[PDB]
Amino acid sequence: FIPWFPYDGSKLPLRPKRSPPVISEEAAEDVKQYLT
Amino acid sequence: FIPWFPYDGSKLPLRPKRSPPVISEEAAEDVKQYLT
């Protein structure tokens, strides 16, 4: 298998500054119970 | 019937400055042909 764009450290990518949320097993409990 | 928020000319609403696209007979046919 050959990737088309192997990792190249001289062309760094963009990413969002913000982080995804931290979700606890308790917030996950409320999501399941409330939001299906 | 009674609206909750009758028209009040003292507080104007917001609207997008740009108008939605005009789609010609011709463009609609291509959408139908290819995209649906």
Add this chain to the structure above:
Amino acid sequence: DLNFGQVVADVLCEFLEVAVHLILYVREVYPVGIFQKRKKYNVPVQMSCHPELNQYIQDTLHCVKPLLEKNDVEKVVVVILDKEHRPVEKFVFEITQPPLLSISSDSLLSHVEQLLAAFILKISVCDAVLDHNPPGCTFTVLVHTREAATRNMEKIQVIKDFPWILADEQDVHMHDPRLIPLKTMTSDILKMQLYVEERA
């Protein structure tokens, strides 16, 4: 915990996007041919496959989303304009979000979507209770805020290269319109009513 303001903003925004598409189809603001049948809230609906139209509607409602989160929206209005850019018909979605307190764990998001389904169904059949629109109409979207609609200018301009302005009176005011109720709902998280303003 859990951000119900964000939950309502989410549900409402998804519903409004589907309802805007359906209004355009059902009132023939664009030709039937650009639309594809889909299902939302287990109701057969119709969505546009025209990419620029889709992006315009998406951008519009993404801008409304942070206002719905804060409950600063009284009304979202789809205005249908005649060939002289005068309002001939308005679909008025009046919104209130109750204090979220006695939450009900019996499938809330499932219950609200059943409530919204009834609105989609009403829009689906409203061609039989409205006069047909004259040829050559376009549409716009109006957002009525609870505070002065110039405090909210910085908050609504969420999308790059998608500015908003204060509407002009001629974009909004219909003189002595006929009001056609379509649907009303209430839930723990949201109340809404939909009616159409038509020329008299």
Add this chain to the structure above:
Amino acid sequence: DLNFGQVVADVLCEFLEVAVHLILYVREVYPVGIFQKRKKYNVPVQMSCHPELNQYIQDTLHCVKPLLEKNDVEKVVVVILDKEHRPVEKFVFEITQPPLLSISSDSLLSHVEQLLAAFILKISVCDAVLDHNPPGCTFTVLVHTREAATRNMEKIQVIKDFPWILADEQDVHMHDPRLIPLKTMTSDILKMQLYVEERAH
């Protein structure tokens, strides 16, 4: 007359959003409880019901959309990170868009959505072919552009208060990773291949 650069950007962005959700689910980045099983492309998917997570993912991909329509994207990468924010696993989506010529048939569209469905189906069962290392606890998304990333900054910043930055070596670089191919598609309007980088043995 029709913006097929926009059509492929739309289809890809919609697909990438579903794939991100499914990756988080299958690789247990977040508790399974937040996910609702739905249907997309006529196949099963697992979508988060957590509002802030949903908004992060939607905003991320909405910012990528103008770069896709300009054919400026080489890779979209889901990087799974551990508590120290070291990469555990990378889901690499390599993308090329060929010149949109010979664009006809009633069939080139649903052919693409069925080709994209093959990626979703494979992610659903990718635990079968990936190493069973401890799962991560957070993630980021990397956008690799054909031109210098630093000059896609104006273009990618579509959403107010959702800024982008150039990634740090630390958060992206895996040393001697094991490459596990998952799926490859070719089509007249889009070619794509998906593989996973695992930590080296």
